[PDB]
Amino acid sequence: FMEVICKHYTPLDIASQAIRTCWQSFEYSDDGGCKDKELIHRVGNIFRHSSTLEHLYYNFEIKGLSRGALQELSRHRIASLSVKSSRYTLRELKEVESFLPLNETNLERAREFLVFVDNEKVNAMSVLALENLRVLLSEHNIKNDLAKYAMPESYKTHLAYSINARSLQNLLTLRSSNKALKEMQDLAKALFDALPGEHQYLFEDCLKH
Amino acid sequence: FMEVICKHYTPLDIASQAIRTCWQSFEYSDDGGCKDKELIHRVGNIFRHSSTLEHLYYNFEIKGLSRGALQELSRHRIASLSVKSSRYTLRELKEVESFLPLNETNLERAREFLVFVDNEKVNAMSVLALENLRVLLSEHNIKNDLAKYAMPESYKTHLAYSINARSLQNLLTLRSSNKALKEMQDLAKALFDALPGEHQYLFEDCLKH
Amino acid sequence: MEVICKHYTPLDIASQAIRTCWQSFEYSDDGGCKDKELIHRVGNIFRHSSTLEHLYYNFEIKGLSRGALQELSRHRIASLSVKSSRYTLRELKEVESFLPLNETNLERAREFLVFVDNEKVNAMSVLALENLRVLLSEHNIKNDLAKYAMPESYKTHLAYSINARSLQNLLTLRSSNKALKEMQDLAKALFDALPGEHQYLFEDCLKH
Amino acid sequence: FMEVICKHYTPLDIASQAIRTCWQSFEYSDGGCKDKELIHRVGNIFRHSSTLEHLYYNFEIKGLSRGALQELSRHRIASLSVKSSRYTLRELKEVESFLPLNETNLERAREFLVFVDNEKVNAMSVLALENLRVLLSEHNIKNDLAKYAMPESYKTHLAYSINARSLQNLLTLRSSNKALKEMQDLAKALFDALPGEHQYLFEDCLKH
Numbered sequence A, B: 001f002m003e004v005i006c007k008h009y010t011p012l013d014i015a016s017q018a019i020r021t022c023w024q025s026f027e028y029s030d031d032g033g034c035k036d037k038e039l040i041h042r043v044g045n046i047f048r049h050s051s052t053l054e055h056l057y058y059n060f061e062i063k064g065l066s067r068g069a070l071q072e073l074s075r076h077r078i079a080s081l082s083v084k085s086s087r088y089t090l091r092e093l094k095e096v097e098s099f100l101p102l103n104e105t106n107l108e109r110a111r112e113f114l115v116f117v118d119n120e121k122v123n124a125m126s127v128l129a130l131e132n133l134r135v136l137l138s139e140h141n142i143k144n145d146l147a148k149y150a151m152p153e154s155y156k157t158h159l160a161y162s163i164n165a166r167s168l169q170n171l172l173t174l175r176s177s178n179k180a181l182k183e184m185q186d187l188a189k190a191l192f193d194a195l196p197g198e199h200q201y202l203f204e205d206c207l208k209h
Numbered sequence C: 001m002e003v004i005c006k007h008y009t010p011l012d013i014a015s016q017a018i019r020t021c022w023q024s025f026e027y028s029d030d031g032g033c034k035d036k037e038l039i040h041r042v043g044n045i046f047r048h049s050s051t052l053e054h055l056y057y058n059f060e061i062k063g064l065s066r067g068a069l070q071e072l073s074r075h076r077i078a079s080l081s082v083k084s085s086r087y088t089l090r091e092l093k094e095v096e097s098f099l100p101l102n103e104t105n106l107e108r109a110r111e112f113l114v115f116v117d118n119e120k121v122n123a124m125s126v127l128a129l130e131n132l133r134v135l136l137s138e139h140n141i142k143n144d145l146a147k148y149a150m151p152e153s154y155k156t157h158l159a160y161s162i163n164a165r166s167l168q169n170l171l172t173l174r175s176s177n178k179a180l181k182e183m184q185d186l187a188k189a190l191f192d193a194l195p196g197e198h199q200y201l202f203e204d205c206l207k208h
Numbered sequence D: 001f002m003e004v005i006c007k008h009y010t011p012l013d014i015a016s017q018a019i020r021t022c023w024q025s026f027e028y029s030d031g032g033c034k035d036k037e038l039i040h041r042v043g044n045i046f047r048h049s050s051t052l053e054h055l056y057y058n059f060e061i062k063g064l065s066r067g068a069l070q071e072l073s074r075h076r077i078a079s080l081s082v083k084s085s086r087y088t089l090r091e092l093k094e095v096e097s098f099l100p101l102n103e104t105n106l107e108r109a110r111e112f113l114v115f116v117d118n119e120k121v122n123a124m125s126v127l128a129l130e131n132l133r134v135l136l137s138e139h140n141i142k143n144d145l146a147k148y149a150m151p152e153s154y155k156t157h158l159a160y161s162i163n164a165r166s167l168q169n170l171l172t173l174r175s176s177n178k179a180l181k182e183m184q185d186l187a188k189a190l191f192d193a194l195p196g197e198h199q200y201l202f203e204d205c206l207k208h
């Protein structure tokens, strides 16, 4: 339910040229053909040689991820993030109407700002929290730096996320697992699906458990 | 109101022995005294050689930091964190009593789970979010993975945190700034105060702005 | 020494990241004047310089010495794939002796060696090179053994990838006058190989 | 046959404490029977292997070749401080000639070179060492130029700091039979320099 766009990626040939550089086997190259694609996959997955995959870089856009899931995504250190800052954007709530009383319309309205999960009760509490947050900002005009303390973890964030193919493999493996938080499994799937189809074969098996 | 402890640190002479290895200046060593300590500060502060500070490691324990602050601390990638997981530890609320009504007694009780800031209205909302979370967990027995979504960012976390001196200088410079969140400025001062007095000269200027 | 930029991230990737933090998309100009200056002004504030990490550059580097390779590999926030001596020394099993040290064998020698501005050093490098050739061809010694007699002037070849924030750091450190000369040359060749459009983010790094 | 010393290490109880911090389960703790096995168990779950990063090791390595240095430098999650050839090469300016090659001078050349399992290679290293010595002593050529004539068997000295998680990776990769012999030697030496109590964390890494 969160939106992931791959905005830029590294042509695969960058990877195969890199691999051939090591053993100087350009003679065996087929000018970016299927044998070159095959090479990235086979060598890229020998552990000692997985650093060749680092030459492939992906620039993503992620919309509608919860702050709670951001906590976990942030722990993958081999990546670059630029994240919508609550310290400077919370005033977005100053302008909206109350979400109380809870009812179908207000619950739909609140989904613009909150990630809902598959429990009605939890979602109701997130809206209650969102409403209190709205009041702090809107009626008492409290600063963002203080008000953010009342914000629920289901609050939506937005980010640019950039990551190389070797780190992306690690991410996909850890977060598509059944031990992983449901939202992180969805993020993993959404990131895979955002990849160009031509690159997806390098990652296809990370999601296999 | 938050506590940082330095559990273990690398002896200073470890860094001096490393500087003297580059240019083989082991001749002018003095068991780590004024000749060796002057060297660490002097050379390590030279950017092309700040690499020498990376040999010093600090193991901290940090108590009473909010999840909000944790989002910011997590973005310092050159460091190691082990964090109390809400996915596994939220059942801690299942035992305790209602925090309603919001009387003076229940406010203090709520402080054990929440970071309070310098605004009474914010804190009151944090406590309301806390009580809804307790209700989800205790009255409805909702699983941690779902309930955490209604958790407020003022919720307290607890972590083990290890960092080398070069990265710690960066962290202290960035988070003692006037532009950093108040809780993070406070963490910066506390990390510094937790350091052995002997080591503090390497970091004092980081705090000067 | 040959440096080529095979691929590079479009500038607007970085400007979209910057605008994401403060949600300032209304004020965008679609990778125009303002978007471009935004990347420069904000990317150079230290607390926001991680914005430049979204820009990635893929390079090919030919003609670098193993000596300078020692120094380039010390930049840890980068990716390299390097021609391996353990596997490619076989290249010497073919060629003809480089003795005597006449101008025809010296020329042939620069195929495999980085020469410096001293004729005597270069001659020593060629002599080390001929003994390496001797171990490989005449005695058929394993690569893993003969490689110990390799001179540090021996040429290497690598794919190198690095992001803008780390490239700023590389170019600053290595264009200094304290840097080995060959590394100063590399810094300059990397800058020169960047798209003209990106160069304004890096040129101050060279200014000492 | 290179010399590896562990100058300082982190107490094991630091990782057991970090591990317990995740689950708030210090209640069952003791760095006793539960703790040491806890570290080994949890550390080896890939999703929780970052608990091992709290353990840090400061080593000194003496007598490693420049050639092996190229490879060791490729492990980027570590800190190294290395004897600079650009400044310390003046060390050769004093010694006598290494020629002619005889049992005595071969022994003297070992002070400066790593020998491998072939006499012919070792002789060529000495030849290159002697030329290097001439450039420096007789021609008074600066280190920055002369280093290009240096053989990769030249010895280096370094301080090396690394955390348990990165060290496991290092030992696994470098103790392979696919690795350069010297690196396999180094992997064994690092393991052996570890305090006995920590070794059970790494011994499996050496087993292929």
Ligand SMILES: Cc1cc2nc3c(=O)[nH]c(=O)nc-3n(C[C@H](O)[C@H](O)[C@H](O)COP(=O)(O)OP(=O)(O)OC[C@H]3O[C@@H](n4cnc5c(N)ncnc54)[C@H](O)[C@@H]3O)c2cc1C
Pocket: A075, A076, A077, A078, A079, A167, A170, A174, A175, A179, A180, A181, B078, B079, B080, B081, B082, B083, B084, B085, D022, D047, D048, D049, D050, D051, D053, D077, D163, D165, D166
């Ligand atoms: C199911 C699950 C449960 C989790 N539970 C917890 C928890 O309870 N508490 C908690 O604190 N965290 C928890 N985490 C986070 C976890 O500890 C990692 O920080 C996170 O998964 C990122 O993993 P990573 O280090 O492999 O990836 P990255 O940080 O992106 O690192 C990529 C690779 O680089 C290497 N690397 C990066 N930095 C270092 C370093 N400094 N030292 C050595 N090697 C390094 C490692 O090989 C790593 O695999 C959990 C993660 C998952 C998937």
Ligand SMILES: Cc1cc2nc3c(=O)[nH]c(=O)nc-3n(C[C@H](O)[C@H](O)[C@H](O)COP(=O)(O)OP(=O)(O)OC[C@H]3O[C@@H](n4cnc5c(N)ncnc54)[C@H](O)[C@@H]3O)c2cc1C
Pocket: A079, A080, A081, A082, A083, A084, A085, B075, B076, B077, B078, B079, B167, B170, B174, B175, B179, B180, B181, C021, C022, C047, C048, C049, C050, C051, C053, C077, C163, C165, C166
């Ligand atoms: C006041 C303030 C406001 C902030 N606002 C925002 C915000 O609005 N949005 C947002 O997303 N973030 C924000 N941040 C986070 C900031 O962008 C950094 O991610 C964070 O502070 C960690 O800084 P660091 O990268 O220097 O440290 P670390 O991640 O620990 O890195 C240490 C050093 O290693 C180098 N390094 C590490 N990784 C890389 C890499 N991948 N590429 C190149 N070099 C690397 C850099 O030199 C860095 O200084 C803010 C930080 C501060 C202090």
Ligand SMILES: Cc1cc2nc3c(=O)[nH]c(=O)nc-3n(C[C@H](O)[C@H](O)[C@H](O)COP(=O)(O)OP(=O)(O)OC[C@H]3O[C@@H](n4cnc5c(N)ncnc54)[C@H](O)[C@@H]3O)c2cc1C
Pocket: B022, B023, B048, B049, B050, B051, B054, B078, B164, B166, B167, C074, C075, C076, C077, C078, C166, C169, C173, C174, C178, C179, C180, D078, D079, D080, D081, D082, D083, D084
């Ligand atoms: C003129 C010159 C002379 C030199 N002489 C010597 C010498 O005699 N001996 C020697 O050993 N080296 C020498 N060096 C190498 C130098 O010490 C660095 O290893 C190298 O320049 C790369 O610098 P860097 O760490 O900043 O870059 P990177 O390794 O790419 O790191 C980028 C940035 O990320 C951060 N970072 C990366 N890793 C860590 C880490 N683990 N901990 C904290 N922060 C980290 C730092 O902020 C760093 O600036 C020399 C370098 C120069 C330019």
Ligand SMILES: Cc1cc2nc3c(=O)[nH]c(=O)nc-3n(C[C@H](O)[C@H](O)[C@H](O)COP(=O)(O)OP(=O)(O)OC[C@H]3O[C@@H](n4cnc5c(N)ncnc54)[C@H](O)[C@@H]3O)c2cc1C
Pocket: A022, A023, A048, A049, A050, A051, A052, A054, A078, A164, A166, A167, C078, C079, C080, C081, C082, C083, C084, D074, D075, D076, D077, D078, D166, D169, D173, D174, D176, D178, D179, D180
């Ligand atoms: C037998 C053998 C043969 C080799 N042959 C060659 C060769 O022919 N040519 C050549 O160029 N190199 C060669 N190498 C070097 C190899 O490619 C690695 O650069 C080196 O082994 C370091 O491995 P590492 O990246 O896993 O370790 P580290 O650099 O210490 O990294 C530790 C872990 O952190 C993670 N990590 C660190 N940086 C990044 C990054 N930027 N992106 C994603 N993840 C990261 C990875 O998970 C990694 O496992 C060889 C190595 C071995 C062991």
Ligand SMILES: O=c1ccn([C@H]2C[C@H](O)[C@@H](COP(=O)(O)O)O2)c(=O)[nH]1
Pocket: A007, A008, A009, A010, A011
């Ligand atoms: O190597 C490439 C090729 C294309 N694209 C991007 C540019 C466009 O935004 C998108 C679609 O491009 P085309 O399929 O039209 O080429 O993919 C890349 O990021 N890298």
Ligand SMILES: O=c1ccn([C@H]2C[C@H](O)[C@@H](COP(=O)(O)O)O2)c(=O)[nH]1
Pocket: A068, A071, A072, A073, A075, A179, A180, A181, B074, B083, B084, B085, B086, B087, B088
């Ligand atoms: O599945 C998990 C569980 C925990 N963590 C990390 C993120 C936080 O820094 C800390 C606690 O996360 P939560 O369990 O509260 O989500 O550990 C993850 O990355 N993934």
Ligand SMILES: O=c1ccn([C@H]2C[C@H](O)[C@@H](COP(=O)(O)O)O2)c(=O)[nH]1
Pocket: A074, A083, A084, A085, A086, A087, A088, B068, B071, B072, B073, B075, B179, B180, B181
């Ligand atoms: O002062 C700041 C502001 C932002 N961020 C990072 C943390 C989050 O990943 C993201 C948004 O943080 P908040 O503004 O919500 O705190 O940017 C910081 O690290 N420090």
Ligand SMILES: O=c1ccn([C@H]2C[C@H](O)[C@@H](COP(=O)(O)O)O2)c(=O)[nH]1
Pocket: C067, C070, C071, C072, C074, C178, C179, C180, D073, D082, D083, D084, D085, D086, D087
């Ligand atoms: O200017 C320098 C000097 C040293 N080093 C690093 C590279 C080697 O790992 C080690 C010693 O190299 P040399 O001084 O021999 O070049 O220190 C550099 O990176 N740049």
Ligand SMILES: O=c1ccn([C@H]2C[C@H](O)[C@@H](COP(=O)(O)O)O2)c(=O)[nH]1
Pocket: C073, C082, C083, C084, C085, C086, C087, D067, D070, D071, D072, D074, D178, D179, D180
């Ligand atoms: O076994 C190897 C082979 C290669 N490399 C890396 C180190 C060098 O940067 C490059 C080529 O090294 P040599 O084959 O020349 O040793 O690849 C290693 O680290 N270990």
